[PDB]
Amino acid sequence: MNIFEMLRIDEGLRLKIYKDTEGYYTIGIGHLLTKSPSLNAAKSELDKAIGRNTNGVITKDEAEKLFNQDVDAAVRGILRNAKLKPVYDSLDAVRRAALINMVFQMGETGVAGFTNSLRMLQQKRWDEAAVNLAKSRWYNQTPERAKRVITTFRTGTWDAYKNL
Secondary structure, three states: OOHHHHHHHHHOOEEEEEEOOOOOEEEEOOEEEEOOOOHHHHHHHHHHHHOOOOOOEOOHHHHHHHHHHHHHHHHHHHHHOOOOHHHHHHOOHHHHHHHHHHHHHHHHHHHHOOHHHHHHHHOOOHHHHHHHHOOOHHHHHOHHHHHHHHHHHHHOOOHHHHOO
16 A cells, blocks of 8 residues: 555545535545635636646546645645654654645645644654544544544554555
8 A cells, every 4th residue: 555545545536526525626536626615716726727628527637647746745745844844754654654644635734733643643652642633623524534544643554444
């Protein structure tokens, strides 16, 4: 298993504009288009994103190309971020995939706000950190995905996804 397969499991794949769990306009593999309520603003962002008149629909290939960029951007974001970089550097390869997953979902800023959890991860206090991460709107809003990510941090294995 790898970060790509992992995220593809967590976000799914949709070829037509859709609303995400928060109610925002998304397409492909969890690619947020706009926080705006206008389908029209969404379609416009979409065309800009893809470079063609999509009319709200894209191909598998287009979805994947957006996905590749988003993963790259997630990694680069962590590498550039002063709160995140040190945690990332401290982690083994599987747990690193777990932090990338959070960042892809909630953004750099968002994850950087989990101060206490970040410190615990850094110190390798797995159980403690799993308990702290669960005390969040994140866990409350998307408990199934949050549990898979948390398990990955707790165990350092891909067990939670081997199921799926």
